[PDB]
Enzyme design. Structure first.
Site, PDB file in Angstrom:
ATOM      1  N   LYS A 118       0.849  -1.179   0.000  1.00 23.60           N
ATOM      2  CA  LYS A 118       0.000   0.000   0.000  1.00 23.60           C
ATOM      3  C   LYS A 118       0.893   1.239   0.000  1.00 23.60           C
ATOM      4  CE  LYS A 118      -4.064   1.851   2.331  1.00 23.60           C
ATOM      5  NZ  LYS A 118      -4.660   1.828   0.964  1.00 23.60           N
ATOM      6  N   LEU A 166      -0.283 -10.792   1.466  1.00 28.40           N
ATOM      7  CA  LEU A 166      -0.891 -10.789   0.142  1.00 28.40           C
ATOM      8  C   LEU A 166      -2.097 -11.716   0.117  1.00 28.40           C
ATOM      9  CD1 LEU A 166      -0.792  -9.834  -2.773  1.00 28.40           C
ATOM     10  CD2 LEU A 166       0.767 -11.716  -3.289  1.00 28.40           C
ATOM     11  N   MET A 167      -3.270 -11.145  -0.121  1.00 28.91           N
ATOM     12  CA  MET A 167      -4.493 -11.931  -0.144  1.00 28.91           C
ATOM     13  C   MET A 167      -4.920 -12.172  -1.584  1.00 28.91           C
ATOM     14  SD  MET A 167      -5.175 -12.339   3.164  1.00 28.91           S
ATOM     15  CE  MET A 167      -3.766 -13.239   2.594  1.00 28.91           C
ATOM     16  N   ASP A 212     -16.534   0.182  10.160  1.00 30.96           N
ATOM     17  CA  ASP A 212     -16.820   0.086   8.730  1.00 30.96           C
ATOM     18  C   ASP A 212     -16.750  -1.351   8.220  1.00 30.96           C
ATOM     19  OD1 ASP A 212     -17.451   0.935   6.172  1.00 30.96           O
ATOM     20  OD2 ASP A 212     -15.427   1.662   5.700  1.00 30.96           O
ATOM     21  N   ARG A 266     -16.381  -4.780   1.078  1.00 29.25           N
ATOM     22  CA  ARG A 266     -15.295  -4.097   0.369  1.00 29.25           C
ATOM     23  C   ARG A 266     -14.023  -4.029   1.217  1.00 29.25           C
ATOM     24  NH1 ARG A 266     -19.054  -0.392   1.802  1.00 29.25           N
ATOM     25  NH2 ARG A 266     -18.498   0.986   3.546  1.00 29.25           N
ATOM     26  N   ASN A 267     -14.168  -4.256   2.522  1.00 28.81           N
ATOM     27  CA  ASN A 267     -13.049  -4.145   3.452  1.00 28.81           C
ATOM     28  C   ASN A 267     -12.561  -5.502   3.958  1.00 28.81           C
ATOM     29  OD1 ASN A 267     -13.009  -1.323   3.288  1.00 28.81           O
ATOM     30  ND2 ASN A 267     -14.608  -1.138   4.862  1.00 28.81           N
ATOM     31  N   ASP A 307      -9.170  -3.627   5.899  1.00 20.33           N
ATOM     32  CA  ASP A 307      -9.055  -2.170   5.906  1.00 20.33           C
ATOM     33  C   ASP A 307      -9.497  -1.585   7.244  1.00 20.33           C
ATOM     34  OD1 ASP A 307      -9.046   0.487   3.953  1.00 20.33           O
ATOM     35  OD2 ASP A 307     -10.589   0.601   5.501  1.00 20.33           O
TER      36      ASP A 307
HETATM   37  C1  LIG Z   1      -4.850  -2.443   0.879  1.00 23.42           C
HETATM   38  C2  LIG Z   1      -5.368  -3.548  -0.062  1.00 23.42           C
HETATM   39  O1  LIG Z   1      -4.549  -4.734   0.221  1.00 23.42           O
HETATM   40  C3  LIG Z   1      -4.617  -5.965  -0.450  1.00 23.42           C
HETATM   41  C4  LIG Z   1      -5.197  -6.177  -1.754  1.00 23.42           C
HETATM   42  C5  LIG Z   1      -5.198  -7.478  -2.356  1.00 23.42           C
HETATM   43  C6  LIG Z   1      -5.812  -7.702  -3.732  1.00 23.42           C
HETATM   44  C7  LIG Z   1      -6.742  -6.826  -4.449  1.00 23.42           C
HETATM   45  N1  LIG Z   1      -7.033  -7.362  -5.584  1.00 23.42           N
HETATM   46  N2  LIG Z   1      -6.413  -8.482  -5.713  1.00 23.42           N
HETATM   47  C8  LIG Z   1      -6.560  -9.321  -6.932  1.00 23.42           C
HETATM   48  C9  LIG Z   1      -5.177  -9.775  -7.465  1.00 23.42           C
HETATM   49  C10 LIG Z   1      -5.372 -10.641  -8.730  1.00 23.42           C
HETATM   50  N3  LIG Z   1      -6.275 -11.801  -8.484  1.00 23.42           N
HETATM   51  C11 LIG Z   1      -7.600 -11.395  -7.928  1.00 23.42           C
HETATM   52  C12 LIG Z   1      -7.460 -10.542  -6.644  1.00 23.42           C
HETATM   53  C13 LIG Z   1      -5.614  -8.784  -4.591  1.00 23.42           C
HETATM   54  C14 LIG Z   1      -4.595  -8.534  -1.603  1.00 23.42           C
HETATM   55  N4  LIG Z   1      -4.037  -8.364  -0.370  1.00 23.42           N
HETATM   56  C15 LIG Z   1      -4.052  -7.125   0.182  1.00 23.42           C
HETATM   57  N5  LIG Z   1      -3.463  -6.991   1.455  1.00 23.42           N
HETATM   58  C16 LIG Z   1      -6.911  -3.773   0.111  1.00 23.42           C
HETATM   59  C17 LIG Z   1      -7.796  -3.600  -1.039  1.00 23.42           C
HETATM   60 CL1  LIG Z   1      -7.233  -3.153  -2.627  1.00 23.42          CL
HETATM   61  C18 LIG Z   1      -9.201  -3.799  -0.895  1.00 23.42           C
HETATM   62  C19 LIG Z   1      -9.765  -4.166   0.353  1.00 23.42           C
HETATM   63  C20 LIG Z   1      -8.943  -4.345   1.498  1.00 23.42           C
HETATM   64  F1  LIG Z   1      -9.524  -4.692   2.659  1.00 23.42           F
HETATM   65  C21 LIG Z   1      -7.514  -4.154   1.401  1.00 23.42           C
HETATM   66 CL2  LIG Z   1      -6.572  -4.399   2.866  1.00 23.42          CL
END
Ligand SMILES: C[C@@H](Oc1cc(-c2cnn(C3CCNCC3)c2)cnc1N)c1c(Cl)ccc(F)c1Cl
Length: 285
Positions: free
Chosen positions: A48, A96-97, A144, A148-149, A165
């Site tokens: 981020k 990484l999610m 919240d 979306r979070n 989030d």
């Molecule tokens: C800050 C950002 O972090 C991440 C995004 C993602 C993410 C968003 N989109 N994708 C796609 C990557 C390609 N395959 C489908 C999912 C992975 C994974 N891990 C995260 N820690 C995030 C996002 Cl962008 C949206 C909601 C959240 F609660 C958070 Cl915490």
């Protein structure tokens, strides 16, 4: 430097693990105020970023969310791997999610007319409720809770949902999600653990509707008047009665009449045990 208190003692910026910028490689964008990347440190991370063109208040907000996430220790809350704050642009490094956020997942994974089952939805719900219980018992109010979070570890059957989030909690600690808010919250600005219970009920609706916006066809102001007048959403398509019942308990008008998360978890568990619930077919568009 800003101080933060959680579950007891205070955290400091220095307590955050600063990762040397040279060790960090950006791989691809992942899609608000700032960008998110897939990265490597090899350890695969989500990065981020803080816009270099930001205010001093923006800076502190960014620092504060790092502190907040770094102090949690629970399997259903996203891990913070560290930060890179001594170089610009500033990074927060997260677990990484791969499954992405929950709302997108539900929309992209809806049963196709040409997969996912009720039990999968219940496990997502249970995962997030476990996260919320942990927050509740540590006297942290998220403010919240919404699809979306929430994030998912992976697309497939082994997925685990986590709260990802904490921007709203961070702001208040020092655009409103009224469709996720109880009356005392949007009328009086009162927030308690019972605030998150209400919002969890709305998240439940999001999950079992498979990613619909709450109160379809209603504006924020209309929802405000609707909810204040005792209006509540109808069941999502095909939603089992035991699941809808959890939602309507979460939306009791008085906070004292709403369940705490221990109770919610128990009732979600009872749903996963009921064959008439989990054998229920999801609607196909
Ligand atoms: C800050 C950002 O972090 C991440 C995004 C993602 C993410 C968003 N989109 N994708 C796609 C990557 C390609 N395959 C489908 C999912 C992975 C994974 N891990 C995260 N820690 C995030 C996002 Cl962008 C949206 C909601 C959240 F609660 C958070 Cl915490």
């Amino acid at each position: 430097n800003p101080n933060y208190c959680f579950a007891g003692k205070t955290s400091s910026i220095s307590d955050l693990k600063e990762v040397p910028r040279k060790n960090i490689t950006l791989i691809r964008g992942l899609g608000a105020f700032g960008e998110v990347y897939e990265g490597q440190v090899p350890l695969q991370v989500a990065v981020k970023t803080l816009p270099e063109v930001c205010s001093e208040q923006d800076e502190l907000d960014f620092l504060m969310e790092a502190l907040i996430i770094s102090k949690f220790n629970h399997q259903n809350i996203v891990r913070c791997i560290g930060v890179s704050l001594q170089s610009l642009p500033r990074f927060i490094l997260l677990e990484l999610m791969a499954g992405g956020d929950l709302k997108s997942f539900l929309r992209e994974t809806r049963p196709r007319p040409s997969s996912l089952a009720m039990l999968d939805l219940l496990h997502v719900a249970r995962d997030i409720a476990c996260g919320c219980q942990y927050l509740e018992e540590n006297h942290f109010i998220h403010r919240d809770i919404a699809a979306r979070n929430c994030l998912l570890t992976c697309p497939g059957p082994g997925r685990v949902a986590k709260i990802g989030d904490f921007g709203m909690a961070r702001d208040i600690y020092r655009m409103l999600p009224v469709k996720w808010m109880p009356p005392e919250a949007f009328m009086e600005g009162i927030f308690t653990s019972k605030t998150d219970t209400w919002s969890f009920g709305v998240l439940l609706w999001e999950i079992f509707s498979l990613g619909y916006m709450p109160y379809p066809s209603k504006s924020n102001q209309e929802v405000l008047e609707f909810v204040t007048s005792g209006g509540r959403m109808d069941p999502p398509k095909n939603c089992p009665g035991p699941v809808y019942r959890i939602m309507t308990q979460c939306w009791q008008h008085q906070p004292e009449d709403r369940p705490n998360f221990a109770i919610i978890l128990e009732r979600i568990e009872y749903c996963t045990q009921d064959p008439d619930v989990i054998n229920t077919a999801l609607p196909i568009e």
